[PDB]
Amino acid sequence: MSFSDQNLIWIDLEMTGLDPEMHKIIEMATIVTDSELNILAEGPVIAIHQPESELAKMDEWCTTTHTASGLVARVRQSQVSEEEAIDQTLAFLKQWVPEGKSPICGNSIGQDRRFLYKHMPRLEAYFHYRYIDVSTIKELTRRWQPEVLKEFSKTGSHLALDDIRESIAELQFYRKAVFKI
Numbered sequence: 001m002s003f004s005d006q007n008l009i010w011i012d013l014e015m016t017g018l019d020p021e022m023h024k025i026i027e028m029a030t031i032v033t034d035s036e037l038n039i040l041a042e043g044p045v046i047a048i049h050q051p052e053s054e055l056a057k058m059d060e061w062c063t064t065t066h067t068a069s070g071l072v073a074r075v076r077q078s079q080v081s082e083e084e085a086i087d088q089t090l091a092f093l094k095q096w097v098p099e100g101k102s103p104i105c106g107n108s109i110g111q112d113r114r115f116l117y118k119h120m121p122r123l124e125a126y127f128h129y130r131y132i133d134v135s136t137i138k139e140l141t142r143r144w145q146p147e148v149l150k151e152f153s154k155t156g157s158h159l160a161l162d163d164i165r166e167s168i169a170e171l172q173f174y175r176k177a178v179f180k181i
């Protein structure tokens with residue numbers, strides 16, 4: 001429908017920790033916006049199965065966060081592997097954005113990309129090499145006019161789809177508050 005090489009691919013992952021060589025992806029969510037940040041479609045929201053030995057690497061922050069959100073129970077019950085999650089996500093993205101055109105979009109999105117390189121390289125390859133990191137704008141705003149940041153807040157639930165929706169909302173806020181284009 002609104003297929004376009006200008007559309008943007010937004011992605012958020014949840015993991016068992018911060019180290020791609022040690023930890024695993026346990027949730028993924030994608031959203032496609034047009035170039036003006038209008039949400040066109042939401043992609044698969046996938047809890048990825050991991051065995052207890054991998055869940056057992058989680059520190060207290062991860063254990064308490066992902067248990068209280070319900071993610072751990074969804075991971076334990078999930079029948080979807082990383083490979084099947086890649087397949088579902090690519091089948092979605094091919095309907096909205098051509099391969100290799102969209103930067104990877106999100107907050108501190110270089111961290112997610114590291115996990116994609118290690119665990120989902122076929123999906124990493126779908127992105128253009130550039131990054132649209134909303135937290136770049138957050139950090140520049142903090143230094144140039146920090147009072148702006150009091151006008152926006154996040155819930156931060158660490159449910160991947162809700163968090164990437166907050167990333168888009170943050171950029172929409174910056175478009176009006178700190179940009180003049």
Ligand code: NA
Pocket residue numbers: 012013107163
């Ligand atoms: Na994130």
